[PDB]
Amino acid sequence: FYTLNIAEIAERIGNDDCAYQVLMAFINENGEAQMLNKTAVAEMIQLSKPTVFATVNSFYCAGYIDETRVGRSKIYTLSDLGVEIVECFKQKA
Amino acid sequence: FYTLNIAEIAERIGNDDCAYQVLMAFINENGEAQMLNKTAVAEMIQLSKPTVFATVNSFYCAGYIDETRVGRSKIYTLSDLGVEIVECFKQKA
Amino acid sequence: FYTLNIAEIAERIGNDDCAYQVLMAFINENGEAQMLNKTAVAEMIQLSKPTVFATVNSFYCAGYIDETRVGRSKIYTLSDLGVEIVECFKQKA
Amino acid sequence: FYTLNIAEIAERIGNDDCAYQVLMAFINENGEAQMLNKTAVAEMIQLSKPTVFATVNSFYCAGYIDETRVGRSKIYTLSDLGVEIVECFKQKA
Amino acid sequence: FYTLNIAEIAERIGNDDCAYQVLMAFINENGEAQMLNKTAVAEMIQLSKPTVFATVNSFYCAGYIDETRVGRSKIYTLSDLGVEIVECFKQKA
Amino acid sequence: FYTLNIAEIAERIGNDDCAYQVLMAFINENGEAQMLNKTAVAEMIQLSKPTVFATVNSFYCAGYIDETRVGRSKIYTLSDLGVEIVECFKQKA
Amino acid sequence: FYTLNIAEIAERIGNDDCAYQVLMAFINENGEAQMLNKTAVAEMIQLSKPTVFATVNSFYCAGYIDETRVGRSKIYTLSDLGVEIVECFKQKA
Amino acid sequence: FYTLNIAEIAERIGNDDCAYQVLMAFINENGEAQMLNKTAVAEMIQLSKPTVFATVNSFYCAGYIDETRVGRSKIYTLSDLGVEIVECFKQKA
Amino acid sequence: FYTLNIAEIAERIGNDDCAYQVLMAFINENGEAQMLNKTAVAEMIQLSKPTVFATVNSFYCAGYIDETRVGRSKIYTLSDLGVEIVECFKQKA
DNA sequence: CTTTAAGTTTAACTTTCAGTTTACAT
DNA sequence: ATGTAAACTGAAAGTTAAACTTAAAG
């Protein structure tokens, strides 16, 4: 339905500390994408649960992270869109 | 760069109270899209500033709302993408 | 009820520093009309709040600027009359 | 160039203490319109010079009051438009 | 109470430089009667303030010029008697 | 040609120290009207020559005092109009 | 204190060219008594200033002419006694 | 260090109801391998928690299932060895 | 079919009390491997029958212990793989 | 952001002094 | 007829009050 420029998105995220760290949390010590529950993310970055959780929620809405039911809770991984956004940043650095 | 299905997004937002209300806040009494600062939104919906602000920020990242500098602060309006998402909901109702 | 000559008005405003700057404040860097709260205007031009606010108020009375409720405060945009007055000035310059 | 509804204007002025009193100052004890310098007006109503003066200036821009040079200063009288606005109020009362 | 011959008065004024110029000061470039403060008159004719002011005062006593309060000062216009006296002179010239 | 109300004139003169004293100077110790040259008047009242002389001149224009050549100078007496004005004051007192 | 025969006086004056002309100088072309300064009299009759002035002075002493201050000089008119003396002469002629 | 015959293993598992069902639990409705927490597995098959959990633990020791930390708990997926064992069974059926 | 690293296995077992004790139960007072029925093992270590039995079963599946029919029941001994795993532990200690 | 107070600037009110002319006296 | 004195007119020299604007405080 709608075409998306991945460079603008990455540009926007880069200008917003919380979005940026929420995104990068899913990338591990060896550069590999990983699974995380909401609590892990909030613990990993130094921002409050409300901030981090709301960001996680919106990023799943945006389709940047995936949600999958696991136990009676949920886990988050970067979507293919998520991984592509992360790539723009890696190239900068 | 990336194609987007507007129905899935709307589906995701509809399953998340905060995202949904943050989005609809921009639609006024007469059905018209309107401008809002971050404070207006948080005051309008009954959720905490941290939740609402983080959601506003991520929605601008996603390209659902636009940011424009005004005074030395910012204001938010739905993008064309934002308006299209709102339309799916209007059709449901 | 009453017909108005837009040239005389513009002539009057041009002979009055405060009116003139209050009017032009609403025109942005790219020539586009923008929204502003009362504080933005007073901060933007180098005149005191009382002067600027009273001018804003009277200009809304005159129908040169519009008022719209937003949060529990108000915002100002040029009316169609406002835009037409601004055009006379642009043509001079 | 532009048509004006006198009822809306009067409606706007009635919702603004300063505009209203600045306007009515020109109507005397016997209901007759009178001439006033800027100082007279500010002295007559209980608002600060900056407020009153800026209002007087904008009302002359709007064409509600007339300016005429007298000595090396100026004096203000209601225009025909001014008188017509005053009439709407008289009818209310 | 007392009848007045306008020709004698004009005759008297014509034989007195100061009276004459004080009177004519109120007649403008286009032949139209105008308003003036005391200072304007003294500046307009080349006689000292004391002379001009005393003449203005006496001419208001005589009923040749009118006084009207304006700001917290006064302004002078020819009365109907004043205008009639000016007419005798215009006819000479 | 023109009818005159003697009460208004007296009212005007009574509100003007110089006019008033210039007029009364012609009334002597015993209530009798007397003759005076311009210098006598200025010496008699405590105002400057320019003020007093200009007032004398205008009062002769107005027809309140008479002028008569005497030596190669002039002398002033109240006219019948002058005497009638003086009477209004006497009645007050 | 002392009674005076007006016929003897007139008889005496008639026998003295200077007295006679000094007296008659005050009677004008139309038979009317008039005001004169000392210089006027001496100019009017063909006798020297010293003669005429001394005569004027003595005639004021005698009470035949009146003196009145006018400017910072004096003027002379016939007294009632003066007029009565003039009448005896008019009757002769 | 040590070579393994996948057929013998599958043969052994097939002769043991619990092992077999613990293994197959990870294969979903569409034949796809899935993630599961320990509780999911015990709920899915009709054997007691102690039995199922101990089996899960030993199967991770054996290298048949993988463990990954997620929240502050763990999740299990078949290893490549696990998938290969499952394939022998699929071929039987 | 599949190669196995004996160090990883031993590492996994060492992080799991039950697996570890089930394994070591087969090593006797003098360091010699011994035969045991399922009941012996559960009695020897202080864990419940269900836990111990399920572990024994899975360890036979894994090929770590051997099963041999004896009477109409079964007995367990470490396989060569079992003995090799036990050796890694002995070396640690 | 608004109101009040203080300071500065502009405008208005004119008064005083000097010179010239006229009148009076010697 | 001339000289001196007085009066009047004209020209030159400022102070006070009011209004407006700006700054500070609430």
Curated annotation (Swiss-Prot), chains A, B, C, D, E, F, G, H, I:
Biotechnology: A miniplasmid containing this and downstream gene tubZ is able to replicate in B.thuringiensis subsp. israelensis and express insect toxin proteins. The miniplasmid could be used to make plasmids for insect toxin overexpression.
Keywords recorded for this protein, A-Z: DNA-binding, Plasmid, Plasmid partition, Repressor, Transcription, Transcription regulation
Induction data: Probably part of the tubR-tubZ operon.
DNA bind region: 38-45, 49-60
Phenotypic consequence of R69A: No DNA binding
Signal peptide stretch: none
Effect of substituting R72A: No DNA binding
Entry superkingdom: Bacteria
Gene Ontology molecular function: any one: DNA binding
BP GO terms, sorted: plasmid partitioning
Consequence of gene disruption: Loss of plasmid replication. TubZ levels increase, TubZ still polymerizes.
Gene3D superfamilies the UniProt entry points to: Winged helix-like DNA-binding domain superfamily/Winged helix DNA-binding domain (1.10.10.10)
Record's function text: A DNA-binding protein that is part of the type III plasmid partition system used to ensure correct segregation of the pBtoxis plasmid. Cooperatively binds to the centromere-like site (tubC), which may seed filament formation by the TubZ polymerizing GTPase, stabilizing TubZ filaments. TubR-tubC complexes track the depolymerizing minus end of the filament, probably pulling plasmid within the cell. Required for plasmid replication. Negatively regulates levels of TubZ; its effect on RNA expression has not been shown.
Note: The pBtoxis plasmid encodes all the major endotoxin proteins (Cyt1Aa, Cry4Aa, Cry4Ba, and Cry11Aa) responsible for the mosquito larvicidal activity of strain 4Q2.
Domain notes: Although this has the same function as TubR of B.cereus strain ATCC 10987 there is little sequence homology and the dimerization interface is different.
Protein name as catalogued: DNA-binding transcriptional repressor TubR
Lineage, broadest ranks: Bacteria, Bacillati, Bacillota, Bacilli, Bacillales
